[PDB]
mmCIF file with all atom_site columns, C-alpha atoms (C1' of nucleotides) in Angstrom:
data_model
loop_
_atom_site.group_PDB
_atom_site.id
_atom_site.type_symbol
_atom_site.label_atom_id
_atom_site.label_alt_id
_atom_site.label_comp_id
_atom_site.label_asym_id
_atom_site.label_entity_id
_atom_site.label_seq_id
_atom_site.pdbx_PDB_ins_code
_atom_site.Cartn_x
_atom_site.Cartn_y
_atom_site.Cartn_z
_atom_site.occupancy
_atom_site.B_iso_or_equiv
_atom_site.pdbx_formal_charge
_atom_site.auth_seq_id
_atom_site.auth_comp_id
_atom_site.auth_asym_id
_atom_site.auth_atom_id
_atom_site.pdbx_PDB_model_num
ATOM 1   C CA    . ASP A 1 1  ? 14.036  -16.518 -74.158 1.00 41.00 ? 9  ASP A CA    1
ATOM 2   C CA    . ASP A 1 2  ? 15.275  -20.694 -73.750 1.00 42.46 ? 10 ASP A CA    1
ATOM 3   C CA    . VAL A 1 3  ? 17.957  -21.297 -71.067 1.00 43.73 ? 11 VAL A CA    1
ATOM 4   C CA    . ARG A 1 4  ? 18.054  -24.343 -70.251 1.00 41.69 ? 12 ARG A CA    1
ATOM 5   C CA    . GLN A 1 5  ? 19.830  -24.615 -74.015 1.00 43.24 ? 13 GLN A CA    1
ATOM 6   C CA    . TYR A 1 6  ? 22.206  -22.359 -72.441 1.00 43.45 ? 14 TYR A CA    1
ATOM 7   C CA    . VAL A 1 7  ? 23.588  -24.791 -69.780 1.00 45.24 ? 15 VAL A CA    1
ATOM 8   C CA    . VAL A 1 8  ? 27.435  -25.680 -69.571 1.00 44.04 ? 16 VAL A CA    1
ATOM 9   C CA    . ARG A 1 9  ? 27.523  -29.582 -70.320 1.00 42.60 ? 17 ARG A CA    1
ATOM 10  C CA    . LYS A 1 10 ? 31.178  -31.422 -69.802 1.00 43.50 ? 18 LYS A CA    1
ATOM 11  C CA    . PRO A 1 11 ? 32.526  -34.070 -72.225 1.00 46.67 ? 19 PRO A CA    1
ATOM 12  C CA    . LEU A 1 12 ? 33.170  -37.139 -70.905 1.00 46.02 ? 20 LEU A CA    1
ATOM 13  C CA    . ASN A 1 13 ? 35.777  -39.332 -72.581 1.00 48.86 ? 21 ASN A CA    1
ATOM 14  C CA    . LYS A 1 14 ? 36.829  -42.656 -70.766 1.00 50.37 ? 22 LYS A CA    1
ATOM 15  C CA    . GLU A 1 15 ? 39.687  -45.132 -71.497 1.00 46.80 ? 23 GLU A CA    1
ATOM 16  C CA    . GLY A 1 16 ? 37.148  -47.927 -74.040 1.00 48.59 ? 24 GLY A CA    1
ATOM 17  C CA    . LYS A 1 17 ? 34.336  -46.174 -72.542 1.00 46.61 ? 25 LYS A CA    1
ATOM 18  C CA    . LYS A 1 18 ? 32.820  -44.292 -76.154 1.00 44.69 ? 26 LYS A CA    1
ATOM 19  C CA    . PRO A 1 19 ? 31.878  -40.996 -74.970 1.00 45.83 ? 27 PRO A CA    1
ATOM 20  C CA    . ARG A 1 20 ? 29.461  -38.931 -74.107 1.00 44.90 ? 28 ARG A CA    1
ATOM 21  C CA    . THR A 1 21 ? 28.429  -35.320 -72.431 1.00 43.18 ? 29 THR A CA    1
ATOM 22  C CA    . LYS A 1 22 ? 26.541  -34.544 -69.507 1.00 43.98 ? 30 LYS A CA    1
ATOM 23  C CA    . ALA A 1 23 ? 24.713  -31.654 -68.040 1.00 41.09 ? 31 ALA A CA    1
ATOM 24  C CA    . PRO A 1 24 ? 23.642  -30.730 -64.294 1.00 41.60 ? 32 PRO A CA    1
ATOM 25  C CA    . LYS A 1 25 ? 19.690  -30.536 -63.560 1.00 42.28 ? 33 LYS A CA    1
ATOM 26  C CA    . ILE A 1 26 ? 18.354  -26.654 -64.073 1.00 42.65 ? 34 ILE A CA    1
ATOM 27  C CA    . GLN A 1 27 ? 17.279  -26.190 -60.233 1.00 43.56 ? 35 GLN A CA    1
ATOM 28  C CA    . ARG A 1 28 ? 15.235  -22.898 -59.400 1.00 43.40 ? 36 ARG A CA    1
ATOM 29  C CA    . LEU A 1 29 ? 13.746  -22.940 -63.222 1.00 43.34 ? 37 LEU A CA    1
ATOM 30  C CA    . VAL A 1 30 ? 10.087  -22.891 -64.187 1.00 39.90 ? 38 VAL A CA    1
ATOM 31  C CA    . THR A 1 31 ? 8.277   -25.944 -65.474 1.00 39.84 ? 39 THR A CA    1
ATOM 32  C CA    . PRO A 1 32 ? 4.687   -26.527 -66.382 1.00 41.30 ? 40 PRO A CA    1
ATOM 33  C CA    . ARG A 1 33 ? 5.280   -28.648 -62.699 1.00 43.08 ? 41 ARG A CA    1
ATOM 34  C CA    . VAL A 1 34 ? 6.020   -25.186 -61.109 1.00 41.63 ? 42 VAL A CA    1
ATOM 35  C CA    . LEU A 1 35 ? 3.331   -23.380 -61.992 1.00 43.71 ? 43 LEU A CA    1
ATOM 36  C CA    . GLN A 1 36 ? 1.080   -26.092 -61.671 1.00 42.49 ? 44 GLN A CA    1
ATOM 37  C CA    . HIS A 1 37 ? 1.907   -26.727 -57.696 1.00 38.40 ? 45 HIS A CA    1
ATOM 38  C CA    . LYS A 1 38 ? 1.344   -23.462 -57.409 1.00 40.81 ? 46 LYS A CA    1
ATOM 39  C CA    . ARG A 1 39 ? -2.248  -23.394 -59.320 1.00 36.16 ? 47 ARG A CA    1
ATOM 40  C CA    . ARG A 1 40 ? -3.212  -26.498 -57.296 1.00 39.93 ? 48 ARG A CA    1
ATOM 41  C CA    . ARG A 1 41 ? -2.308  -23.962 -53.935 1.00 37.82 ? 49 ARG A CA    1
ATOM 42  C CA    . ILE A 1 42 ? -4.343  -21.244 -55.227 1.00 35.20 ? 50 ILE A CA    1
ATOM 43  C CA    . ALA A 1 43 ? -7.595  -23.416 -55.703 1.00 37.07 ? 51 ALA A CA    1
ATOM 44  C CA    . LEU A 1 44 ? -6.962  -25.022 -52.305 1.00 37.23 ? 52 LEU A CA    1
ATOM 45  C CA    . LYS A 1 45 ? -7.538  -21.290 -50.971 1.00 37.83 ? 53 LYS A CA    1
ATOM 46  C CA    . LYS A 1 46 ? -9.996  -20.963 -53.659 1.00 36.94 ? 54 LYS A CA    1
ATOM 47  C CA    . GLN A 1 47 ? -12.267 -24.146 -51.640 1.00 36.53 ? 55 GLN A CA    1
ATOM 48  C CA    . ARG A 1 48 ? -10.980 -23.415 -48.045 1.00 36.40 ? 56 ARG A CA    1
ATOM 49  C CA    . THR A 1 49 ? -12.816 -19.542 -48.805 1.00 37.97 ? 57 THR A CA    1
ATOM 50  C CA    . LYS A 1 50 ? -15.410 -21.035 -50.302 1.00 38.36 ? 58 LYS A CA    1
ATOM 51  C "C1'" . U   B 2 1  ? -2.238  -83.040 9.390   1.00 39.12 ? 7  U   B "C1'" 1
ATOM 52  C "C1'" . A   B 2 2  ? -4.550  -76.562 14.938  1.00 40.23 ? 8  A   B "C1'" 1
ATOM 53  C "C1'" . C   B 2 3  ? 1.533   -82.624 16.136  1.00 39.31 ? 9  C   B "C1'" 1
ATOM 54  C "C1'" . C   B 2 4  ? 5.664   -82.676 19.097  1.00 43.45 ? 10 C   B "C1'" 1
ATOM 55  C "C1'" . U   B 2 5  ? 10.395  -85.679 20.653  1.00 41.83 ? 11 U   B "C1'" 1
ATOM 56  C "C1'" . G   B 2 6  ? 16.292  -86.797 23.813  1.00 42.76 ? 12 G   B "C1'" 1
ATOM 57  C "C1'" . G   B 2 7  ? 18.702  -84.093 28.180  1.00 40.36 ? 13 G   B "C1'" 1
ATOM 58  C "C1'" . U   B 2 8  ? 18.516  -80.753 35.280  1.00 40.98 ? 14 U   B "C1'" 1
ATOM 59  C "C1'" . U   B 2 9  ? 17.116  -86.046 39.917  1.00 44.32 ? 15 U   B "C1'" 1
ATOM 60  C "C1'" . G   B 2 10 ? 18.857  -91.537 43.672  1.00 48.54 ? 16 G   B "C1'" 1
ATOM 61  C "C1'" . A   B 2 11 ? 13.342  -91.112 42.110  1.00 47.69 ? 17 A   B "C1'" 1
ATOM 62  C "C1'" . U   B 2 12 ? 8.570   -87.359 41.069  1.00 45.28 ? 18 U   B "C1'" 1
ATOM 63  C "C1'" . C   B 2 13 ? 5.926   -82.923 38.983  1.00 44.55 ? 19 C   B "C1'" 1
ATOM 64  C "C1'" . C   B 2 14 ? 7.196   -78.056 37.244  1.00 44.25 ? 20 C   B "C1'" 1
ATOM 65  C "C1'" . U   B 2 15 ? 9.915   -73.647 34.824  1.00 44.76 ? 21 U   B "C1'" 1
ATOM 66  C "C1'" . G   B 2 16 ? 12.918  -73.793 31.119  1.00 43.98 ? 22 G   B "C1'" 1
ATOM 67  C "C1'" . C   B 2 17 ? 16.492  -73.521 28.172  1.00 48.32 ? 23 C   B "C1'" 1
ATOM 68  C "C1'" . C   B 2 18 ? 19.673  -76.460 24.656  1.00 51.39 ? 24 C   B "C1'" 1
ATOM 69  C "C1'" . A   B 2 19 ? 19.125  -80.439 21.058  1.00 51.27 ? 25 A   B "C1'" 1
ATOM 70  C "C1'" . G   B 2 20 ? 16.376  -82.549 17.960  1.00 51.54 ? 26 G   B "C1'" 1
ATOM 71  C "C1'" . U   B 2 21 ? 12.134  -81.949 13.448  1.00 52.10 ? 27 U   B "C1'" 1
ATOM 72  C "C1'" . A   B 2 22 ? 10.141  -80.504 8.342   1.00 53.78 ? 28 A   B "C1'" 1
ATOM 73  C "C1'" . G   B 2 23 ? 10.285  -76.683 4.512   1.00 54.82 ? 29 G   B "C1'" 1
ATOM 74  C "C1'" . C   B 2 24 ? 12.702  -72.409 2.425   1.00 53.76 ? 30 C   B "C1'" 1
ATOM 75  C "C1'" . A   B 2 25 ? 17.333  -69.498 0.960   1.00 51.92 ? 31 A   B "C1'" 1
ATOM 76  C "C1'" . U   B 2 26 ? 23.245  -69.095 -0.575  1.00 50.71 ? 32 U   B "C1'" 1
ATOM 77  C "C1'" . A   B 2 27 ? 27.534  -71.939 -0.664  1.00 54.28 ? 33 A   B "C1'" 1
ATOM 78  C "C1'" . U   B 2 28 ? 29.599  -76.834 -0.239  1.00 51.69 ? 34 U   B "C1'" 1
ATOM 79  C "C1'" . G   B 2 29 ? 30.988  -82.116 -0.473  1.00 53.36 ? 35 G   B "C1'" 1
ATOM 80  C "C1'" . C   B 2 30 ? 30.004  -86.471 -2.447  1.00 53.06 ? 36 C   B "C1'" 1
ATOM 81  C "C1'" . U   B 2 31 ? 26.835  -88.892 -6.437  1.00 52.47 ? 37 U   B "C1'" 1
ATOM 82  C "C1'" . U   B 2 32 ? 24.347  -88.596 -11.496 1.00 49.36 ? 38 U   B "C1'" 1
ATOM 83  C "C1'" . G   B 2 33 ? 21.029  -92.344 -16.838 1.00 48.91 ? 39 G   B "C1'" 1
ATOM 84  C "C1'" . U   B 2 34 ? 16.960  -90.246 -19.902 1.00 49.72 ? 40 U   B "C1'" 1
ATOM 85  C "C1'" . C   B 2 35 ? 13.351  -86.008 -21.039 1.00 47.44 ? 41 C   B "C1'" 1
ATOM 86  C "C1'" . U   B 2 36 ? 11.125  -80.563 -20.471 1.00 44.77 ? 42 U   B "C1'" 1
ATOM 87  C "C1'" . C   B 2 37 ? 11.467  -75.831 -18.012 1.00 44.60 ? 43 C   B "C1'" 1
ATOM 88  C "C1'" . A   B 2 38 ? 15.059  -72.958 -15.929 1.00 47.90 ? 44 A   B "C1'" 1
ATOM 89  C "C1'" . A   B 2 39 ? 18.193  -69.354 -11.802 1.00 49.22 ? 45 A   B "C1'" 1
ATOM 90  C "C1'" . A   B 2 40 ? 22.583  -67.423 -12.887 1.00 49.90 ? 46 A   B "C1'" 1
ATOM 91  C "C1'" . G   B 2 41 ? 29.363  -61.544 -10.443 1.00 49.29 ? 47 G   B "C1'" 1
ATOM 92  C "C1'" . A   B 2 42 ? 23.033  -58.867 -6.393  1.00 50.47 ? 48 A   B "C1'" 1
ATOM 93  C "C1'" . U   B 2 43 ? 25.728  -60.273 -1.308  1.00 50.19 ? 49 U   B "C1'" 1
ATOM 94  C "C1'" . U   B 2 44 ? 32.764  -58.623 -0.587  1.00 54.04 ? 50 U   B "C1'" 1
ATOM 95  C "C1'" . A   B 2 45 ? 34.510  -53.982 -4.989  1.00 55.74 ? 51 A   B "C1'" 1
ATOM 96  C "C1'" . A   B 2 46 ? 28.683  -48.402 -8.147  1.00 55.36 ? 52 A   B "C1'" 1
ATOM 97  C "C1'" . G   B 2 47 ? 36.198  -51.957 -7.335  1.00 54.65 ? 53 G   B "C1'" 1
ATOM 98  C "C1'" . C   B 2 48 ? 39.922  -51.590 -12.243 1.00 59.55 ? 54 C   B "C1'" 1
ATOM 99  C "C1'" . C   B 2 49 ? 39.401  -52.679 -17.587 1.00 60.89 ? 55 C   B "C1'" 1
ATOM 100 C "C1'" . A   B 2 50 ? 43.205  -54.918 -22.590 1.00 55.62 ? 56 A   B "C1'" 1
ATOM 101 C "C1'" . U   B 2 51 ? 39.744  -56.388 -27.224 1.00 58.44 ? 57 U   B "C1'" 1
ATOM 102 C "C1'" . G   B 2 52 ? 35.645  -56.937 -30.643 1.00 55.92 ? 58 G   B "C1'" 1
ATOM 103 C "C1'" . C   B 2 53 ? 30.423  -55.379 -31.161 1.00 56.47 ? 59 C   B "C1'" 1
ATOM 104 C "C1'" . A   B 2 54 ? 26.300  -52.830 -29.011 1.00 58.21 ? 60 A   B "C1'" 1
ATOM 105 C "C1'" . U   B 2 55 ? 22.124  -46.030 -32.951 1.00 56.17 ? 61 U   B "C1'" 1
ATOM 106 C "C1'" . G   B 2 56 ? 21.355  -45.124 -37.179 1.00 55.64 ? 62 G   B "C1'" 1
ATOM 107 C "C1'" . U   B 2 57 ? 18.692  -44.186 -41.178 1.00 54.55 ? 63 U   B "C1'" 1
ATOM 108 C "C1'" . C   B 2 58 ? 16.491  -42.937 -48.696 1.00 53.01 ? 64 C   B "C1'" 1
ATOM 109 C "C1'" . U   B 2 59 ? 11.164  -42.596 -50.336 1.00 52.20 ? 65 U   B "C1'" 1
ATOM 110 C "C1'" . A   B 2 60 ? 7.463   -42.270 -56.571 1.00 53.42 ? 66 A   B "C1'" 1
ATOM 111 C "C1'" . A   B 2 61 ? 8.245   -37.898 -53.341 1.00 47.66 ? 67 A   B "C1'" 1
ATOM 112 C "C1'" . G   B 2 62 ? 14.739  -32.361 -50.248 1.00 47.60 ? 68 G   B "C1'" 1
ATOM 113 C "C1'" . U   B 2 63 ? 19.895  -31.794 -52.973 1.00 45.64 ? 69 U   B "C1'" 1
ATOM 114 C "C1'" . A   B 2 64 ? 23.394  -35.931 -58.459 1.00 45.53 ? 70 A   B "C1'" 1
ATOM 115 C "C1'" . C   B 2 65 ? 27.608  -31.944 -64.009 1.00 51.57 ? 71 C   B "C1'" 1
ATOM 116 C "C1'" . G   B 2 66 ? 31.420  -38.516 -59.412 1.00 48.11 ? 72 G   B "C1'" 1
ATOM 117 C "C1'" . C   B 2 67 ? 30.737  -42.327 -66.459 1.00 49.22 ? 73 C   B "C1'" 1
ATOM 118 C "C1'" . A   B 2 68 ? 31.390  -45.596 -60.103 1.00 47.62 ? 74 A   B "C1'" 1
ATOM 119 C "C1'" . C   B 2 69 ? 28.457  -47.853 -64.014 1.00 47.50 ? 75 C   B "C1'" 1
ATOM 120 C "C1'" . G   B 2 70 ? 25.306  -47.249 -67.447 1.00 50.50 ? 76 G   B "C1'" 1
ATOM 121 C "C1'" . G   B 2 71 ? 20.506  -45.523 -73.215 1.00 52.31 ? 77 G   B "C1'" 1
ATOM 122 C "C1'" . C   B 2 72 ? 18.201  -45.064 -78.167 1.00 52.55 ? 78 C   B "C1'" 1
ATOM 123 C "C1'" . C   B 2 73 ? 19.955  -39.206 -81.252 1.00 50.32 ? 79 C   B "C1'" 1
ATOM 124 C "C1'" . G   B 2 74 ? 26.154  -37.395 -78.454 1.00 49.38 ? 80 G   B "C1'" 1
ATOM 125 C "C1'" . G   B 2 75 ? 23.253  -30.302 -81.570 1.00 52.03 ? 81 G   B "C1'" 1
ATOM 126 C "C1'" . U   B 2 76 ? 16.809  -32.200 -77.383 1.00 54.98 ? 82 U   B "C1'" 1
ATOM 127 C "C1'" . A   B 2 77 ? 18.671  -29.050 -68.622 1.00 51.56 ? 83 A   B "C1'" 1
ATOM 128 C "C1'" . C   B 2 78 ? 17.604  -33.657 -65.955 1.00 49.23 ? 84 C   B "C1'" 1
ATOM 129 C "C1'" . A   B 2 79 ? 17.002  -41.640 -69.029 1.00 45.80 ? 85 A   B "C1'" 1
ATOM 130 C "C1'" . G   B 2 80 ? 17.494  -44.912 -64.547 1.00 48.87 ? 86 G   B "C1'" 1
ATOM 131 C "C1'" . U   B 2 81 ? 20.996  -48.184 -60.579 1.00 46.32 ? 87 U   B "C1'" 1
ATOM 132 C "C1'" . G   B 2 82 ? 23.742  -44.561 -57.814 1.00 45.73 ? 88 G   B "C1'" 1
#
RNA sequence: UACCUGGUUGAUCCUGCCAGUAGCAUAUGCUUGUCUCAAAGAUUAAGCCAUGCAUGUCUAAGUACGCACGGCCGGUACAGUG
């Protein structure tokens, strides 16, 4: 199940400033780039052995 | 530039030092118009210190929910400067 949709977003409301909601950058999350880094590491091991 | 000169005697040769003589280095005195380079609290006290400064640092690439600013949908985790 999606995890980014379940983060707590904090609301902001300043005098004169239009209102906005802000959410933190989720850490230790699995993204395509984490998998890409893992695959590149594994492939580097492959080329070393070869 | 491998150099000497005055002084012992009534006078003479000599030992021999004193003094002269030139540079260099620190201080000091007098004087001082340009211009270039340039040493400089070592000597006495490695004595004592008011105050200020002299060591900080972020990239695309460790960590950003500081509206501190800021976007184009404030129902798309993280837009960016920070």
